[PDB]
Design a binder for these strands. Structure first.
Length: 76
RNA sequence: UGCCCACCCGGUCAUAGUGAGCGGGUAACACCCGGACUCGUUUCGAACCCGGAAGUUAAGCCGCUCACGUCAGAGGGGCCGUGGGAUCCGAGAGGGCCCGCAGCCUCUCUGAGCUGGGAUGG
């Protein structure tokens, strides 16, 4: 299923915080194209953030046996 | 030779400045000698004007060193605009975004006199 790792920049009045409660998320998806939609899907409406100020910095794949979160883990 | 080294005549008008220290002169340049005549000091040969010319690199001049002033280069930091467009956001004030441009201050480091025309000196 190839779990993905997303870390990108979105802004209203400098909402950059490359850490984990006001800036970025995790994703489970097949490929980049499906994955890249999801961040648009959520951050686009959940906080009124246009894809203008969306700037994906790092996108990659994590291995299935090491993620700091168990909630994303057990759902398999 | 030579050319630069000063000088006279300059242009550039501080990157070329100011201040201090030091170095260079037997020519050049001044300092410096003396005033009867020229001229002249609301006193003075101070200065100017004339006649000079012993001494002398201490002045100045010149070069160099260091400071500051000052032009740039780079770095750090400070601060931040404006054209072009939308039934875009925001009630407004305002702001983002796509199309074009930037500059501003302040510290650090690095450079910092160029050049035309003629008579001396090497």
């Amino acid at each position: 299923v190839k779990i993905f790792m997303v870390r990108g920049t979105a802004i209203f009045s400098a909402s950059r915080f490359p850490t984990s409660q006001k800036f970025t998320k995790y994703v489970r998806a097949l490929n980049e194209k499906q994955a890249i939609e999801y961040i648009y899907s959520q951050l686009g409406g959940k906080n009124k953030i246009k894809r203008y100020n969306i700037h994906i910095q790092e996108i990659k794949e994590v291995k299935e046996d090491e993620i700091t979160d168990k909630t994303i883990r057990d759902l398999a």
